[model samples]
Structures are given as C-alpha cells and as structure tokens.
Target: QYSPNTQQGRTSIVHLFEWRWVDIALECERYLAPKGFGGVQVSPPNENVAIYNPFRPWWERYQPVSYKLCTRSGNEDEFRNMVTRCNNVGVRIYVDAVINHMCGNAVSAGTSSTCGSYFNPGSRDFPAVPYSGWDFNDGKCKTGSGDIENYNDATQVRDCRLTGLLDLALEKDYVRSKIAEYMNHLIDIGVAGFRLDASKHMWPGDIKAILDKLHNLNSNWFPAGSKPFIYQEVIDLGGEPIKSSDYFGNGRVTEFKYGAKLGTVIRKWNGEKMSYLKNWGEGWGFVPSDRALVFVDNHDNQRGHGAGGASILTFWDARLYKMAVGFMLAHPYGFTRVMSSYRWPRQFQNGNDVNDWVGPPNNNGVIKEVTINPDTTCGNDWVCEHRWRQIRNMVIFRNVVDGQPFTNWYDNGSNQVAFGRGNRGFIVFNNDDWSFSLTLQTGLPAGTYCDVISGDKINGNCTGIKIYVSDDGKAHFSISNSAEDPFIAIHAESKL
Candidate 1:
C-alpha cells in the first residue's frame, strides 16, 4: 500500500484542484479530516510561467520554468505549512509534478524574468537552474524538432516535447538531480508523494532514478521507515506503446479507463443495474487495483483535454455523474480520487484563459474573480462539484466501509443499483428518470440505519433520511428521479 493507506482505512481522495495552500490547511482541519478522506491531491507546487495572455490558465502550472515553488497556489512557505497542517489532521498531500518539460515558448514577459530567471527556448536559456542549451535532449529526440510527433516510437514519446512544452534531458545526471532536488524538497516538507504529469513523455528509468534520490518523509509526519508514496500519470489505455506497465515497478499508474467503463455501464443499466464486477478489472486491462489511481473525471478530462474519450462524467451530467462517482466509492478497487470542481460553461475550452475561468461572488450577488463558494460551488463561471452533499456523503461512506469487500451484489438491467460492502455498508442509485420502490437485500443487522449519504446522524435520529433494516437484513426503499438526490447510503459509524 502507499504511505497514505487511507491512514484510517478510508477509500477516497478528494482532488483539491486549484486551491491555495493556505485554504487547503483550513479545509483539512474544518472539512477533509472529519470527512474521512484518504488525502488531497494538490495542484503543482513549482513556479511556472505566468501567461497573462491566458490570465493564468491552469496549464501554466504544467509549464514550469524552475523548481522555485512559486505559483498561484502559494510559495514554498505556504506549501510547507499546508503539508504540516494536513498531515497533522491525518490527511496526506500529493503533488502534481511536471518533469517532462519546461515553460512554453515565450516572448519578453515578467513571469519569464521572475520564475524563469533566464528561460529562452531558442537559445535554451534556463538560468533559474543554470540549465543552458546543452541540458536538453534536443538531438536525441530523433523527430523533426525533438518534439513528440510519433506515438508509435517509444523513444520519441519518452524523449521529445509534449504540446510544444520544452523537453528535459532526464537521461542526463544533472537534469535528474535537478528534478530530484525539487521532489526531495517536497519530501523534506512532508508531502507523501506525487502525480507525475506528462510521465508518458519521460523515460521510466529516469523517473526511477529520481525516485531513488528522494529521501523519505520527514520523521515528524511519517514513521521512520516510511517511503514517499508515488503514483505516476501514465494514462494507459491498453494499445498505447507507452503503457503504464513501463512505470509500474516504481508506483501506481492513474487508471484512465475506469471512468469510461463507468459511463458505459451507467448508460446501459440506468435503472436496477447489477454489479458489473464480472468484467470490471481484467476486461479493461487496467493497472492492477493496488497500482491504480482511479477517478471518474479530472481537471483535464472534465474539460475534454487530457486523454479525451466518450461517456465521461462532468458537472453538466449531474445525476449520472453522481451515480458514476457513487459506484467507484462503493466498490473496492484502485485508490480512488473524487473530482472537485467549480462550474464553467459546458462548452468552454479547457484552456488556462481568464474568460474560461470561474469563481465565487463578492459583497454583491455579482461574481468575483476565481473564488469558490463556501459550499464548494463556483460563482464566477466556476462549478464546485466536490461540495455537493451527496458526493461528500459518499466520501464519508467510503471511509467507514474501508477494508470491507463487496457482498450481496444486486443490479438489474435498468436505472436502479444496490450493493453491500462486506455487510458493513449498503448503497443504492436510481437513474430511471422516475420514481422507484423495492425491497433490497441490505445484509445488515436488523435495526435502524442512518442514511449517511444524506447527512451524518446523531443518537438514533439522523439529520438526513433513515432506513429500517429487518432482522433478516432486508430493507424497503424508494427513490424518485425528480428528487434533488437520487441515491441513499447507510453505514454503521458516524465518523471513520
């Protein structure tokens, strides 16, 4: 298991996308810790090119010029503070690292001067780390401009450019050390691990070398023998030449297919859906459950950018999205990450443009810049999906059902879905676009159970809906498609 291991056996991670380090600390103490989340995957912590032309598109973070730890999220100080605070509350932090490239081709710009120091692509002037033209693998790229144009050639994929981002010579000892220095600095600050972005564009051996250089987490936060947990963003989809397996020996690979499968199954079995475990893992050729970073949607896919495909869940598909996320949490498989987002125009391109960004409102009802609602909804053209009650409740349910296997699976070919978690938890989802009523095999002891999905209960009373479990472990329940929430989940504990 990764160093996180859910700490308390929780099964879900909430991607705190675009959140400031300071805000993350507050959220850890106020929300994530109590909710039993496995951890939070934070945005890139390194200093990146600030493209004002796009008004700080999130991808700018993907185009780093140095390892200064200075970006929109926060500086090194705030980042370290966030790590300490979250770890103190038993929530771990995972960083999004971009090692395959440097900043994009730029003209005279302030970000280039401040963050880049002397980043000039034509002359390969990266003075921030004193990297000159000799440092890049331009010659070894083999393709036209050392840019990644051929996916069939493994060498080009691992040695060339991605989306025109500057390519690094990971094979070089100096480059490896620079990357390691940045990652080690994070480890020293108590970060548990990282999500290696553009990993498909770098050689796995070089990544392993960098990991070798990383020191363990600071003893104050992790055990003496604890190694930094690592999960690579291989984005494997089977036939790709750069399959996730190339990096599996080092750590887990993001399972990009799980959500695609969820979309297919949900669309087919909209009501009374059965447990589709028959072809769940193997059929998809997904990295083994233990080495998979599973999520229905991420910042890239939600905007139809990275690894784009069909039947994916986004904020626009509210009801079906909920069902997809609920099923991922309910069933045991790869390490799960729940998508958190602010609302945006459904057709907005997934670019790092101000016009494409969204935020919360100010003193008046009018929207402010880039801030999200306390309820997690975005106001200024942003949609904060993570703060939704049903999704958050499912995070709680995953924590309570940790270590339990799926049992008493029941799914019909329609809009209804129900399943038991080793008799410790039970959940149901209805997507029939109408009301539903039926007795379910809950596999729970004869007693009343709080529907944790609605809200945590107190005493024998729950703030949300309640369920009655017969002595025989059967419960009668009903759901309406017109209802605000179309699912119900019950667990045995109030806190993880």
Candidate 2:
C-alpha cells in the first residue's frame, strides 16, 4: 500500500486539481512525462451530488453520491482512457477517493448527477449506491452538534458527521464491501494509487479491512505483486486527540504542518531566524519523512478551508510560492505533491466577500474545457503551476539526486542558505535584501553546470546562468537581491 509505483528516477506527484480526464491524458503525454513527473493526483472521479444553488462549488466532489466512475472530471470511459494513456507515458494516476462519507443532509432530490444518480440526503437515501440511513453512523456520535466540533474528543472527531456530511458506518460489513468494491474496480482499471479523503473520520481498522479486500494492481502498468499507493488525509496539527500517527499503519498521512512551517519560513526569508530551516524534518514536529505526503498547498488550504488558515502560501503569492516549492523539491524529505490550480474569480480573491466555495472556470454548471496556450502555459483560468519552468526543472533536480544525503551545508547565519545533494546536485538561496557572494564547497566534480531555476540547459548550451566548479569542488556563487529569481540550482545531469 505504500509504493507510489512511479517510473524509476521520477519522484514528484502534481495534483492537477479539478483537471478533466482528457486534459490529464494530454498533459501526461505532452508535459508531465517529458518533465519527469512521477504521477498525477486527479480530482475525485466517483459520482457526487450536484449543488446548483451554489452554482457547483468544488467541494461537491467530496460528498460522494455513488461509487460509479463518473464526476465533473469525466465519465468511466474517459477515466479509463486517461489512466491507460497516462500509464503508457510512464506517468501514473492517483484518484482522490472520497469514501468516508456521502452527501450531507442539505442536498435535495431535485439535484441530478452526471451518472444519473439521485440523492435525498434528508432521509440518508442515495438510490445510486442504494445506501440508506442504516448504512451511516447514527447513535455512535457523542457530539452535541452531531458535527465535528471538538478536536479533543476522538469519538466526536471520528464518529460524528463532518460539516453535516453523513458519516458512513464503515464498521458494517456491507459498508466495507461496498467501499472495497469501489476501490477494487479502480485497481482493475490500472490506477496506480489513491488519496483517501477525510480518512481521519474513518476508523483505521475499517479502512484496513477495505484495503485487504482490494485486488492487486493490474499487472499491465505495475509489477506482479505491487499494491496501490495509499496516502490518507489526516490533518493532525499536534495536540489533537486523533493524530496522524493513528493512521500511519494503513498508509502515508498528510503532513499539513510541513507546508504551514515552510510558509512561515519562506515569507520571512529576509530575516535571520529563517536560517533554522537547516533541520526541517522531525525537529519541527512533523511526521517522519517516509510516511508523510508533503506539499506547499492543497485545494482546501489554498482556499483557507483546512488547517493553517491564511498562513498557507498559494498561487496568489507566486514568487514566494515558487521559492517554497523549490526548497521542498531540493530537500530530501517526504513524498512531494505539487498543486496545479485555476485562477479564482474576482469574488473569490479579495477579502471583501470571500467566496471559498466557488468552483473552477465554469459556464452555467459545466466546467470549461482546459486550454493550453501556445507558450505551454494554461489558459481558461488555470494556473498550471507545474508547467512553470522553475518548478518543472526542480523535478529533474530531485530525480538526479534521489537517495542522496545532504552535504556541504552553508548558511550566512541568516536567511541565505546553500547545500549540496551528495555530488549530484547543489542549490543556493539568498533571501536577504543585499547581494551576497561567497566561495563555497559545491561538492560536485569540475564542470560547468546550468542554473535550472533561472533558465534551461538547451542543446549543449545554457539559456540562463552557469556555475563553474574547480577540481577541488569549490565554486564562487553569487546572488543579487534584484535578480528575478532568489534561488539557483545545478545537478550532475545539468552539465554543459
């Protein structure tokens, strides 16, 4: 369940949040595969409630109506085609599995889904899945509001409804069978893995039982005995009764604190205190590296829905956000996932009247088709941060230096920091206001390496800055505060 099953040397997963299946397939062939991205974390593909009154908010997918492979992203055929096409290009697909609950009580029967599923949440009725009130947790909830109101109470957090979303009684054998069948159907379709939504609300044992019932991954893309990669969403920010460690045995848990801390450190890169990022992992109270799925921001946190509140960095802060992502990909920590989002409408941007529930660029109710510009950037209101030159190049740096430990650490007793990834890669950052020049040990062999952040290493030439290392592995690196980029990275593969 822990194996990501990425093509060898590819180590990053980009969450193409709300991207259509056809677009994802094209992306895998045209962009991700060539850029060396390991996998694509797609939006939930299962059928979900249709909320017209709110004009189809993004969170509707989190409230599943049935296990059918149909949602705003695409239908079963398109999903299958996307998986097959993406796998063909060595880029795997990971579905966002929303199995913890069904549509909340607010959804009405008048609403219709893409799969022709009807839901009447008032009586806990979903005819598509044939789930009734008996399939949910009724008497097990101990909270007064019947919703998750207290983080100190484990039973309330687990058994109660999340924001009035009907909590499924996963402990029931029938419920386990239904959920398992849904997962197994995807596994049979050549999916590489899953991102369990609201996993903290479900019992670990129940999840384990469901996974146990799942079939091995289809041998077409994966190895004979390979298991699907499972990364559960458990927002444990410390001092919580239900911790991420509770679900560690099942799969990797989301380490939200990692992004939260990075946001703080990167935002204050001009200050001396930011240099403490030298020891960033366990010392910062984050989950261990192996079991944590790290990211700069997610769909929820980007809109201020989950933990970290407004402190989390998103596409809005483009400069700092890229810097944060550079630090993440450069450091050998957790399994990384990058966010590719859409530009929120005017109403959703400013604080005048924050509309966090707004969906992606849509016409009436249907999501607009994603368009790629001539310059390789996304149109139709998509951010497509993964396509940015800096971010994409870092993926190559990570792959080149994979399994190597940090060495040749240098910090100016301030925000300026530089480190080498064994002898394969070296990166330096100057967050200070003034320009700085230093003769540092790059720990790389004598060569002229391209600085990937500023530009690319084209056919036997560098389109950006270059660093020359002597035989003794010493290089004079300099960074100006006025430069467009605050970081410079070079890997062994970047030799000119």
Candidate 3:
C-alpha cells in the first residue's frame, strides 16, 4: 500500500484537482510525461449528489451517490480511456475514492443537477446502489448533534455524521464488499492506486478488509500480483484523539502538518531563524517518512478547507510557494504530491468578494474544456503551477539526487543556507536583506552547470544563470536578497 507503483526513476505525482478524464489523458501525453511527473491524483470519478442551491459548489463531489463511474469529469468510458492512455504514456492515475459517507441530509433535490440517481438521506435510501437505512450508522452516533462536534471523542468522530452527511457503517460486510467492488473495477481498468478521502472517519480494520478484497493491478501496466497503492487522508495535527499512526498498517497517511510547518519556516526565514530548517523531518513532529504522503497544498487546504490554515503556501504566494516546493522536492522525505489548481478570482485570506464554493470554470453548469498555450501554460482559470520551470525542473533535480544523503551543509547563521545532495546536486538560498556571496563546498565535479530554477540548458548552451565549479568541488555562488529568484540549484544532469 505504501509503494506509489511509479515507473523506476520517477519521483513525484501532481494532483489535477477537478480536471476531466479526457483532459487528464491529454495532459499525460502532452505535458506530464514530457515533464517527468510520475502520476496524477484526479478528482472523484464516482456519481455524486449535485447541489444547486448555492450554485454548484466544489464540495458536492465529496458526497457520493453511487459507485458508477459517471460525474461532471466524464462517463465510465472516458475514465477507462484515460487510465489506458495515461498508463501507455508512463503516467499513472490515482482516483480520489469518497467511500466514507453519502450525501448530506440537507442536500435536497433542486432544479440544477448532476446526480445520476435519486437519494433520500433522511431514510438513508440510495436506490442506485440499493443502500438502505440498515447500511448507515444511525443508532451508533455518539454525538448529541448527530454530527461530529468534538475532535477529542474518538467514537463520535468515527460514527457521527460529518457536516450532516450520512455516515456509513463500514463494519458491515455488505458495505465493505460494495466499496471493494468500486475499487476493483478501477484496478481492472489499469488504475495504479487511490487517495482514500475521509479515511480518518472510518476504522483501519474495515479499510484493510476492503483493500484485502481488491484485485491486483492490471498486468498490462503493473506486474502480476502488484497490490494497488493506497494513501489514506488522515489529517492529524496533534491534540486530536484519532491520530494518523492509528491507520499506518492500512497505508501511508497524509501529513497535513508538513505544509503548515514549511509555511512557518519560509515566512520566518528573514528573522535569522532559518538555520532551524537544517533538521526538518520527524524532529518537527511529522510522521515517519516511509509511512507519510506529503504535499505543499491540496484542494481543501488551498481553499482553507482542511487542517492547514491560511498560513499554508499556495499558487498565490508565487515566489515563496516556489521556494517551498523546491525545498520539498530537493529534500528526501515522504512520497511527494504537487498541487495543480484552478484560479480563484478573489483571495481567501483577504476579505474579497469571491465565491469560494464555485466549481471549475463552467458554461451554464458544465465544466469547460481545458486548453494549454504553446508555451505550456494553461488557459481559462487554471493555475498550472506545476508547469512553472522552477517547480518542474526540481522534479528532475529530485530524480537526480535519489538515494543521496544531505552533505556539506553551510549557513550564514541567518537567512542564507547551502547544501549538497551527495555529489549529484547542490543548492543555495538567500532570504536576508543583502546580496550573499560565498565560496561554498558544492560537492559536484569541477564543471559548469546550468541553474535550472531560472531557465533550461538548451542545445549545449545555458539559457539562464550559469555557475562555474572550481577544482576540489567548491564554487563561488551569489544570490541577491532582493533578486527575482532567491535561490539557485545545479545538478549533474545540468552539467555542460
């Protein structure tokens, strides 16, 4: 369950939040494979309750109506085609499986709809899957409100409704089988794995039972007997009764604190406290690297939905966000997932008049087709941060430094720090108020290297900044504190 099942030498996955299946297939061939991204975490493909009262919010997809692979994203045929096409291009698909609960009781039928079938949450009736009241946790809810109100109570947190959604009784064998059926169908279609949404709301034993019934990945893309990769969403940030470690045996748990802590470190780098970033892993209260799945910002967190507050960096934080992503990929940590988001006209942190609940760019309610410009940037409202040269090039940097240990660490006792990834790559950052110039140990062979953050090494010529390495593996590197790019990186692959 921990293995990403990515092709050898690939290191990262991008979450194409709310992207259509057909668009995902196109992205695999045209952008992702060429840029070296391993896979994509796509939006939920199952049928979901459509809400129109507030004019089609993004959270509506989190409310599952049935296991049928039909949603605003595309139909089942499109999903199967996407999986096959993506895998053929060496890019895998990880579906966001929303099996924790069904539609909320407050979600009544309306004029605008995308739901394929009828659902009556009051009686726990979903005719499409033939689920009835018996499949839900009615009498088992321990909360006075019947909806989760206390994070300190484990029983209430697991059995009660979340924001009025009908909680499923996953303990029942029937419910487990139904969930397994949906997953197995995806596996047969060549899906590599899943992101278990709201996994903390269910028991680990039941999740393991459902996963136990899942078939191996299709032999066309994966080896025979290869188990589908699983990474459960367990947002544990300390002081919570349901800790992330409780679900470790089932699969890797999402570390929400990783991004929160990074945001803090990045924002505070100017205060001479940046040296504390030298030891960044478990010492900072994160889960073990092998059992954790890390990300800079997710769909929920970027919109202020999950545990990560406004402090978490996103596309809006342009420079700092790129620096944080660069650090995340450069450092050896958990299996990384990069976020690719759509543009929200107004800011969340600021008091702007924006509809945060609005879905992707649509025409009358239908999602629009995603279009990419010749320069590889996206058009419409999508904020394709993964396409940025700094972010994508670091993907290659991560691959270049795979299995290498951190070496030759140096710091100015303040906002300037430098380090090497064994002898394969070296990077430096300057966040102070002056130009930083130092003769530092780069740990690379004496040669000229291209700075991937600014531009590419094209046709045996450096298109951006170039760094010349001297004998004995030392380089005179300089980065202005007020420069457009606050950091510089070089790897063996960029050597001239």
Candidate 4:
C-alpha cells in the first residue's frame, strides 16, 4: 500500500509541469522543501511516441508506446535519481499516469523522427510493453472505426479507444498486470503516488482491479501499510454522465468543480459586488477535504481543453490570482495543488512544445528558451503562476495553519471580507480599490502579529499591519489595494 504526501502533513503539491528531472530535484531541495510543500506532480515519465508536428505539444507525452522511463523529462536512470533525491529531501513525487490510451497514428503529413520508431497501431505494436493488436479491445468496441467516439456509451468509452489512441483491454489479466507492473516499478523507485489521467475513460471495475494488483510502497521510505495515494482524473462539470463519484470507491477524485467556485468568488470580489464567506468545498458538492485534489486551473483548462469551468485565475490575471490563491491557502479545504505552467498560444497545448530535441527546431515551432521577466515573472511563453509571491506566501500560510478551520468569519456583504483560522491564523481581504477599515474579531492572545500578505514582521513594532489581540479576541484592521498588498494575514506562530 502507498499513501500520498499529505500523510506527512504536506499542505500542497506543486505541478512542476514540464521541468526536467534534474531541475525538479534541485527545486525539491532549494524551494519546495523549505516551503513545506507536500510533493510535486511530475509529467509522465514513460517513453512516449515522439511527435514533431505542432513542434512537441505537451499531449505528445500523453501518448505512450512503452514504460521505459525515457521521454522528454529524462531517461530511466535520471528519473530514478530524481525520485530518490526528492524523496530523500522529504518531498514526494507523484507521476501523471496516462494509461487510458496509446499514441494516435500520424496524419497524412507522414510521421517524422518525433514519432518514435513507428510501433504500428494497426498491429497494436508496442514492443516495449510487448502489446500487440490482439491485446487491444477491438471486439469490445461498438463503433465502426474501433475508436472511442461516444461518451454516452460506457463500454465503448472505456473498452474502445481515446482520441484514436490505442486503448488497452483492462478486462484482461495480462493488461492489468502490465499496468500494475509499470506503476509498481515507480512505487519501488519511491514515488509517493499517481494522478490517474483519463480515469473516466476507464471502467471503475477495471481500475479497481488494477489497484488491487499494485504492490505496497517500498518500506525503505514508506511506513508499513502505506497505500499509494490515488487521485483519479474524472472531468465532471455538472452535466457529464461520467461523474467523479464513480471513482470515489478507489480513492480521492479531482474536484473539477473548484474551478467554477474560484471563478465565482473572484468575479464577485473583483467586480465590487457582494462579499460572502465562500466556505465552498463540500457545500458545492465537492469531495470532503480528506479526498480531493483542488486547483483553480489545470494543464487542460489553462489552455482551454475540456470543461474549463468559468474563466478562472491564471498568471494572466496576476492581481486577482494572488487574492484567489491567498484565500484558498487561508481557508482550509480540499487537498491543494498549485498550478505551474509554461506560456502557451492555445489553452489545450501540451508540454512537448518546449523544444527538447537537439535539431534546428521542427516546423511546429517549439520554444527553445524560456524567458523570465525583470519582475521575476515568466516570459517567452511560460506561465509559472505558482512562483508568484502571494501564491507562495499562502502556501507557507497554509502550512502554518495546517488542519485549522475557519473560525471568526466576517463578511460585510458589499466591500470587505475577513476570517480567523481556528484562532491560529487570521486574514482580511479588500476588493475595493480604495482603503477601508474595520475593527473585527481577532481570536488570538494579546501580541503583535505580522501580516503575511503585506510582509512578515522583522522586529517588535509591526512591519505590516500591527494588531493587538484582546482577551476577548477582538482587533482593528484596515486594508486597501493602494498599499503594497490588499490583504493582511497573521498566523499563530508568525513572528512579530
């Protein structure tokens, strides 16, 4: 059995999106470890059918030909090294598992070297996995073309193919073992858990069977009886027939609804409309805090792939994104995942476009260099939103108030909002462009506190918004966007 990083009290997981193994290992030691990050959701580490067109779209990695641990990220040895290093530093690694389908056939443009030594899909040729046409679910497909064409048809959706990619017949014992073996290999290498990509495309029963076959985590790092923490990807935006509930039996399910809720809060706050506690999560039908992977934007939605909910926060909306992420960390909710992305022209664009090849750049125009602006923001088409000061600060704040619930909630219907974190932390947000003041509840002992949003206190005299907590848990605080920060936050252990 393997458990996720939260088992170690990690408050959040950062999607190191397309970072190489070396870079990831460095990040774990230098940044993530210090920030109290729970883990990092790395890109798929398996060997994928290489593509040249669209010049290495991220989805190309989504197409698998083998489980050789060779891809744009690095080779097997490098991957093993990364996991070992990150785990040793107290940071876990979660692999993105793309087991739902294999690579699609190249268009008439003719395949290039990017299409890693053509393993004929017509023959179901995946020599690495040694899967042949016979191993596929041809007979199970109700569609004339044997591809997954309908979501309404459950059997075809799971048993057929996805995006013309070869679909494995999970009903077979051999397929289950192969899948389990690939995952177990990672577990053996010390990966904390997995993000089951396209879980909706696979039958729940088949998934359950696969989980059953998985070996427990390697005892060297994990404790006895630790099960790999699984968070299945089921994109449900209210009307989808394949609801997230289907995968609840196995483990936590990605709460896609969080995107919409975040959007709702931002819209109201930014528009100078109404203010509400926004204690969202389960009230909005999300899974309980113990079983959910929550984020405002994902690789798909940031680029506009499937149900992207409402237009939510991204690096593009710097200010509001800060506020949104700040509130998210301030309030205790579902398992948190911070989104890290490269800039993209299209929303659904994949990661392979970052130019991993050594050639003169393919016709698809993959970016060769990622440029970070003077402001420490990304340029040259990279959106590393997780690196923002406010977002990162909240990550620290969340860790400081880990497991604490919102206590003294204050919402002034029109302009301001504030709340206490189980009396361990307190925060106030102002959407109005102008300055505002309020003497609200501050559930803390008499002491000077540092406002995290403005800046952490250095000496005794409050560096940010200094507040004295009366025995009755009351204090006065004011905020305005005109200042360096529009929000002020103080946690129990924060120094002043």
lDDT of 1 by residue, 1-496 (tens): 2545348566677887777788779878877787777788998888777565544555666777778887666778888898999999999898898888887644343445324454666677777777777788777778876567878888888777775677888888998899899888888888888888878887889988888898887888777877877888877766667788778878888888887667767666343133454346656577778888889988877765446364577777888788678878877788889887655444444543324433222223222344556655545554556567678777877877888887776665565678888778898877665677889998877787777666667765788777888888999987887766788888777422
Candidate 3 wrongly placed segments (more than 4 Å): 109-115, 269-272, 347-354
**Of the pair 2 and 4, which is ahead by lDDT?**
2
The best candidate in terms of lDDT: 2
The Cα local distance difference test for each model comes to: 0.74, 0.88, 0.87, 0.74
Q: Candidate 2 lDDT, tens digit per residue, 392-438?
A: 99988999999999888889888889998999999999888888798
Clashes in each model (backbone N, CA, C under 3 Å)?
23, 0, 0, 19
- TM-score for candidate 4: 0.88
Model 3 is weakest, by summed lDDT over 10 consecutive residues, at: 107-116
C-alpha displacement of 456 in model 4, angstroms? Answer: 2.8
Candidate 4 residue spans exceeding 4 A from truth: 1-3, 105-118, 269-274, 277-279, 345-383, 432-435, 457-465, 481-485
State the number of backbone clashes in model 2: 0
For candidate 3, the lDDT comes to 0.87
Q: Relative to the unseen true structure, what is the C-alpha lDDT of residue 29 in candidate 4, on a scale of 0 to 100? A: 80
CA error at residue 471 for candidate 2, angstroms: 1.0
Given candidate 3, what's the lDDT at residue 223? 88
TM-score: which is higher, 1 or 4? 1
Put the candidates in TM-score order, highest first.
Answer: 2, 3, 1, 4
